[model samples]
Target: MVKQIESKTAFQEALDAAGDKLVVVDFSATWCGPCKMIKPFFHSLSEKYSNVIFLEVDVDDCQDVASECEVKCTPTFQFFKKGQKVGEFSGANKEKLEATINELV
Candidate 1:
């Protein structure tokens, strides 16, 4: 399941829970068109890649987390490993998203 980050504390707990696993965080907003489009694909990825930890953060709901991560755009995907950011991109590019997962995994 894709975990929902609703607060900074929750985000921290999720990060710790992920341990050394590859973490994929989707920074999005409810009003974003592309974000809505990519939501299902992101969820599907979570099911497909059992080893990866998937998370979704609503930019509006978690402004502090978004600002801390420097998420300037909706639908931005951040990749982390061992609690460190490794890669990031903005868009609904499934190919690149999958490629990132493949490269990191």
Candidate 2:
């Protein structure tokens, strides 16, 4: 299941829970059209990759997370491994997103 992180503390907790696995943090907002467009793609990814930890950070409610991750754009995807950020793919492109997961997995 995709975890919903609402605050900095929960974000830390989620990252800690991921351990050595890849954690995909989706920085999004309800009002963002592009963010909504890619929501299902992320859900599909979560269902397909059981070893990966999926998280959604609603930038509206979790602006701190966005700021901490330096998310300058909505619908930014941050990839982390072993609690460390490895790579990131901004915007909503399926090919780039899949490639990132493929590289990590």
Candidate 3:
């Protein structure tokens, strides 16, 4: 099952566990319109890409993580590989999101 990351501790664990795998972090909030619009696509991608570890961080619940990642916008995605951040973007478009995923996956 896909996991939900809810705290800075969990985020750190995810980074450690990801190792050589690609880890995609979806930074979002319940109040964000675009975040709601694109959430399903992210869910679908999570299921489709079994090789990648998809994690969602609710800014409301995990403010520390948002601060640490310097996430200034909702639906911001941070891609990590080998515990290193490799790519990131903020938007609601599927094409760009998919392209970022493809680059690492």
Candidate 4:
């Protein structure tokens, strides 16, 4: 499941609990059109890649995380490995998103 972050604290715990696994963060909002575009695709990716952890943060609900991630826009994908943020890209470019996932996994 692409667990939706409902609180700021839980977001931090999710990262710590993920350990060395690849953690995928989708920083999006309820009003973001681009977020809706790639929402389902990201869901499917979660199922396709069980080895990774998928998380979604609603910008409105967790503004703290948004700022911590330096997410200025919606539909931002942040990839983390071994508690270190390895890479990230904004926008809804599925090709690049998938490629990056594959590269890390």
RMSD of 1: 1.3
Expressed as tens digits, the lDDT of each residue in 14-86 for candidate 3 is 8888767788888888567757777788878766888878888888878998999888877788888777888
lDDT of each: 0.85, 0.82, 0.80, 0.82
Q: Which lDDT tens digits does candidate 1 get at residues 11-42?
A: 88898998888998988886677578877788
lDDT of 3 at 18: 73
Report residue 39 deviation for candidate 3 (angstroms).
1.2
**Over the stretch 1-105, how does candidate 2's per-residue lDDT look in tens digits?**
688888998888888877878788888886778678877888787778787889888989889888998878777889877778898878767778777788988
Which candidate, 2 or 3, would have the higher TM-score against the true structure? 2
| Candidate No. with top TM-score | 1
TM-score of each: 0.91, 0.90, 0.87, 0.88
Model 2, TM vs. native: 0.90
The true-versus-predicted C-alpha distance at residue 62 of model 4, in Å, is: 0.6
Worst 10 residues of 1 by lDDT: 30-39
